[PDB]
Write an enzyme that holds these catalytic residues in place. Sequence first.
Site, mmCIF file in Angstrom:
data_model
loop_
_atom_site.group_PDB
_atom_site.id
_atom_site.type_symbol
_atom_site.label_atom_id
_atom_site.label_comp_id
_atom_site.label_asym_id
_atom_site.label_seq_id
_atom_site.Cartn_x
_atom_site.Cartn_y
_atom_site.Cartn_z
ATOM 1 N N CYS A 258 -8.087 10.184 6.542
ATOM 2 C CA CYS A 258 -8.048 9.929 7.980
ATOM 3 C C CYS A 258 -6.710 10.453 8.489
ATOM 4 O O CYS A 258 -6.602 10.939 9.622
ATOM 5 C CB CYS A 258 -8.198 8.429 8.262
ATOM 6 S SG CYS A 258 -9.939 7.873 8.307
ATOM 7 N N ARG B 125 -7.085 12.556 12.113
ATOM 8 C CA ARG B 125 -8.355 13.098 12.582
ATOM 9 C C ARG B 125 -9.302 12.100 13.268
ATOM 10 O O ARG B 125 -10.086 12.473 14.149
ATOM 11 C CB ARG B 125 -9.085 13.782 11.427
ATOM 12 C CG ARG B 125 -9.605 12.834 10.350
ATOM 13 C CD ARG B 125 -10.754 13.468 9.574
ATOM 14 N NE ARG B 125 -11.217 12.670 8.439
ATOM 15 C CZ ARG B 125 -12.199 11.778 8.492
ATOM 16 N NH1 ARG B 125 -12.841 11.548 9.633
ATOM 17 N NH2 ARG B 125 -12.547 11.111 7.398
ATOM 18 N N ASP C 82 -9.428 4.068 14.540
ATOM 19 C CA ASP C 82 -9.996 2.862 15.122
ATOM 20 C C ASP C 82 -8.804 2.284 15.925
ATOM 21 O O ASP C 82 -7.817 1.852 15.324
ATOM 22 C CB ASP C 82 -10.397 1.909 13.985
ATOM 23 C CG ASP C 82 -11.077 0.634 14.472
ATOM 24 O OD1 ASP C 82 -10.642 0.049 15.485
ATOM 25 O OD2 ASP C 82 -12.045 0.197 13.809
ATOM 26 N N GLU D 127 0.820 -1.208 0.000
ATOM 27 C CA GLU D 127 0.000 0.000 0.000
ATOM 28 C C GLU D 127 0.865 1.274 0.000
ATOM 29 O O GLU D 127 0.598 2.203 -0.766
ATOM 30 C CB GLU D 127 -0.985 -0.011 1.178
ATOM 31 C CG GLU D 127 -1.741 1.300 1.392
ATOM 32 C CD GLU D 127 -2.835 1.211 2.457
ATOM 33 O OE1 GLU D 127 -2.518 1.040 3.654
ATOM 34 O OE2 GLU D 127 -4.024 1.322 2.101
ATOM 35 N N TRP E 209 -8.528 -1.544 -0.533
ATOM 36 C CA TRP E 209 -9.254 -0.480 -1.213
ATOM 37 C C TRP E 209 -10.360 -0.958 -2.148
ATOM 38 O O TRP E 209 -11.032 -0.146 -2.798
ATOM 39 C CB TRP E 209 -8.278 0.409 -1.987
ATOM 40 C CG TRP E 209 -7.406 1.254 -1.089
ATOM 41 C CD1 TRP E 209 -6.142 0.965 -0.670
ATOM 42 C CD2 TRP E 209 -7.739 2.527 -0.505
ATOM 43 N NE1 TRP E 209 -5.667 1.976 0.119
ATOM 44 C CE2 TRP E 209 -6.624 2.945 0.241
ATOM 45 C CE3 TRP E 209 -8.870 3.352 -0.548
ATOM 46 C CZ2 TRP E 209 -6.598 4.156 0.945
ATOM 47 C CZ3 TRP E 209 -8.847 4.561 0.153
ATOM 48 C CH2 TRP E 209 -7.715 4.950 0.888
ATOM 49 N N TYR F 159 -4.772 8.939 -1.335
ATOM 50 C CA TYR F 159 -3.405 9.270 -0.920
ATOM 51 C C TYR F 159 -2.304 9.391 -1.965
ATOM 52 O O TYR F 159 -1.470 10.286 -1.855
ATOM 53 C CB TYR F 159 -2.935 8.368 0.206
ATOM 54 C CG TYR F 159 -3.751 8.492 1.461
ATOM 55 C CD1 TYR F 159 -3.711 9.649 2.230
ATOM 56 C CD2 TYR F 159 -4.561 7.447 1.890
ATOM 57 C CE1 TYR F 159 -4.465 9.752 3.392
ATOM 58 C CE2 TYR F 159 -5.316 7.544 3.052
ATOM 59 C CZ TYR F 159 -5.262 8.691 3.791
ATOM 60 O OH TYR F 159 -6.000 8.783 4.936
#
Lengths: 316, 316
Positions: free
Chosen positions: A198, A218, A221, A60, A82, A146
Amino acid sequence: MLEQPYLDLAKKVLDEGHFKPDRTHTGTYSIFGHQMRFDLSKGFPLLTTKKVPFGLIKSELLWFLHGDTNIRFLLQHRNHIWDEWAFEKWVKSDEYHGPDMTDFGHRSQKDPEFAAVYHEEMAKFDDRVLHDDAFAAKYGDLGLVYGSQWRAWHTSKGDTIDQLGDVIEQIKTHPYSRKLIVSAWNPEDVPTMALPPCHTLYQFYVNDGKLSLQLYQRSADIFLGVPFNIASYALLTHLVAHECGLEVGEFIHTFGDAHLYVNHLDQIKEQLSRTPRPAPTLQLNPDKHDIFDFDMKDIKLLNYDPYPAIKAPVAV
Amino acid sequence: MLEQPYLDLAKKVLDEGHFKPDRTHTGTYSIFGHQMRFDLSKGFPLLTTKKVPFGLIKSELLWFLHGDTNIRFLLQHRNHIWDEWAFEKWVKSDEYHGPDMTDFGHRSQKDPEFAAVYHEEMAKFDDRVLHDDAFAAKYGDLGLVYGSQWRAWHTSKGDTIDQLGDVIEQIKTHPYSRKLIVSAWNPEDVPTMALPPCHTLYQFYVNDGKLSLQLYQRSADIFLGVPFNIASYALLTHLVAHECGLEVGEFIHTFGDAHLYVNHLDQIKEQLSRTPRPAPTLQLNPDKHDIFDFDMKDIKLLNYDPYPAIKAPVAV
């Protein structure tokens, strides 16, 4: 032990968390404002009290470093993280005619035979992107994600900015810059994105021939995401330090809304019974320094010996 | 006491600070990654161990809340904090013919009779902006500064976004959003701005009918700036909570590169000998809630009883 801050975050959310309403059904216990750092000279912070698949994060992040935004690269690496985001947009096409789906996953939580057929449709999707070029092009590309944020920020004047490329060069020429920031948060784009970043923005810092990076997240989990989140930005640090012929320092992880879903309580209580093992070590190809032209086998993790993985419902 | 985290930051930088090269001459001791929070229910965090002029921050934040970017509003309030930025651009005009200046301030540190004449030129500048409309318009407007960032982000599609207006409405309709962010960091703009935002972005959070805000600051002067920085974002919190008919909670201040210039060492050692006094209380006009249509007298500080101000050379 290196991973303690994580275990401390888990404990903390479990005591000081206040109940909160989540855009789900599965409630959460949350906290706001928290900071934890990882001295990367002491080992690579990949959770040992739980098995976390490096290969997935390794791929990733290269997907990100390559300015890539197409699912093909990930599917071409068995990375299905994704898949839902792109799939989603596909089952919302006129080309799509098969069995209906309204906000699946959640709709697959109350799993009927449906979920299995859904499995066949994802199968049918992935493969399409995987072997057909034009398909991969319309539904495989996610766009504002991203990879494009970091290296293809779109200007008003029609051009495209390579934030990460510019900052790496910046680290090289002016290592003492307090302006070494790369944001993934674009105001113009945030209101219509299914998933606004995120990981909102990060900053580099050269202390003593040592690179350090702080990430501002921001939302988080605690159980599912943070374990991946830590390794990703600790690795970025290693790669940037690598290209910049700089030593590594500290990785600070800052949070806005850190939360733990209720449906992960027994899972996190348990992972907390385990004591940490010595942390793994990283290795990057010495004979290669262009972290953008980097390939999978150029990153090696050593001595990773974790406790079994904890099975928990994916955030709902 | 409420302000202790600040005193703790000062101590910390003084022990754990590493020497660093600054874009000045006056070196600094710095640290990277730090978090301090202020329970706003316990009083307004305006330093008591040092006299900090509220009026100035009170006016500057309204300048921000009004979407204003022109110096006239501040000069019309005896606020000269932004004078150098605008002045600078003026002495770089063909309209400008008077005595030459090359990066003043610093060039005024080794103060000759020059500085005094410079004083007459600032005088001559300010007044121009203060009484002539067209002048105020070309050199009085700073453009890309906090007022336009927060409420006039420019799109690629030519329009303008009101981040703060949208988020305040957002807090009202979906108080449990982890997407309550307003950035002041625009990638397209950051490379040619004399001063890219020091306050990079902030986030709101509704916990229990209580508003809280975290600020992420990329660089910070422990002695000079942070004292202002704290009150500004603690006040914003109060104003947003006000309009949103919400109670107040916590103010978290996160830092990237927090530093203290060498030329402030004796000054901060001294302010540290003082013990804090009870902190002041704020008041906002009850019969008024549009924090954008807010005026100076609608914000009242009570019981502010500080120790004298510490005179220190302005960061160099």
